[PDB]
Design a protein around this ligand. Structure first.
Ligand SMILES: [Ca+2]
Ligand SMILES: [Ca+2]
Ligand SMILES: [Ca+2]
Ligand SMILES: [Zn+2]
Ligand SMILES: [Zn+2]
Lengths: 161, 124
């Protein structure tokens, strides 16, 4: 047994929005990130805007009351928590970072895809081209490497299709 | 956790302690605070040693227990290997993350190994 969601149908909420991107681009980055994981699993995601959700998404800086403060611009870009109640599943993004929906350094969708991988119960990959690689990498299209696919399917199984 | 790996230069100025040390054994974990500590046999200090504030031990490096929240997970077979630890001083304990500059000493280039000797201090 290792931290995994008992349910297959999960909920998420964007608590607050970054001023770096328009609301729609933030919504798109998050949705498409969840899409990558739901594509290869029987896992389902639903955005809510009121009340508490399984995966809470937020943009915060420095000390933000979770015992893992951010470090200003650079360094730590974002982090997340393994499946569980309360803070479990939540993903936090450093606001001191400049967030983008393009090649300009620090693509939100690319990072979110990684951090949501943690939200579902994945560890870091050592494969340089894997989404679950801890260092920031961007090569245009962000897609799951076989290591990512095998990791998440080893927990939740294959897609229904 | 997502990190932009720091260039040795900028990590030197940001960190409070840029020591050389060896990791003794398996990480000790406190499953109530979700932090983790590695017992380290310290060999040499390049910053430190000035000590502002502080600070101390140093034979324990601290890091979050969970990899997802930037807990540093040590990837080393041999136990006698020397590592360059470049971390922050919080309270009185040396802290480190996935994003902290931790690399084996021998794997560093000549410019890098000369950098910690007395070159990066100029770049701050
Ligand atoms: Ca940061
Ligand atoms: Ca949660
Ligand atoms: Ca920002
Ligand atoms: Zn956080
Ligand atoms: Zn990560």
């Amino acid at each position: 047994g290792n931290p995994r969601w008992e349910q297959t149908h999960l909920t998420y909420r964007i608590e607050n929005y970054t001023p770096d991107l328009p609301r729609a681009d933030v919504d798109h980055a998050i949705e498409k990130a969840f899409q990558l994981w739901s594509n290869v699993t029987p896992l389902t995601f639903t955005k809510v805007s009121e009340g508490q959700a399984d995966i809470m998404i937020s943009f915060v800086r420095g000390d933000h009351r979770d015992n893992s403060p951010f470090d200003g611009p650079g360094g730590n870009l974002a982090h997340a928590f393994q499946p569980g109640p309360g803070i479990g599943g939540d993903a936090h993004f450093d606001e001191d970072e400049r967030w983008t929906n393009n090649f300009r350094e620090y693509n939100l969708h690319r990072v979110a895809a990684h951090e949501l991988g943690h939200s579902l119960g994945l560890s870091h990959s050592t494969d340089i081209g894997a989404l679950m690689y801890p260092s920031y990498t961007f090569s245009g299209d962000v897609q799951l490497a076989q290591d990512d696919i095998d990791g998440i399917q080893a927990i939740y199984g294959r897609s229904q299709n | 956790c997502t990190c932009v790996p720091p260039h040795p230069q900028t990590a030197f100025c940001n960190s409070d302690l840029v020591i050389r040390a060896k990791f003794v054994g398996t990480p000790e974990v406190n499953q109530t605070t979700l932090y983790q500590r590695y017992e380290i046999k310290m060999t040499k200090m390049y910053k430190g040693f000035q000590a502002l504030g502080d600070a101390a031990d140093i034979r324990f490096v601290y890091t979050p227990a969970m990899e997802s929240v930037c807990g540093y997970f040590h990837r080393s077979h041999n136990r006698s290997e020397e590592f360059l630890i470049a971390g922050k001083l919080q309270d009185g304990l040396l802290h480190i993350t996935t994003c902290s500059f931790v690399a084996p000493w021998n794997s560093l280039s000549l410019a890098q190994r000369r950098g910690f000797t007395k070159t990066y201090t100029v770049g701050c």
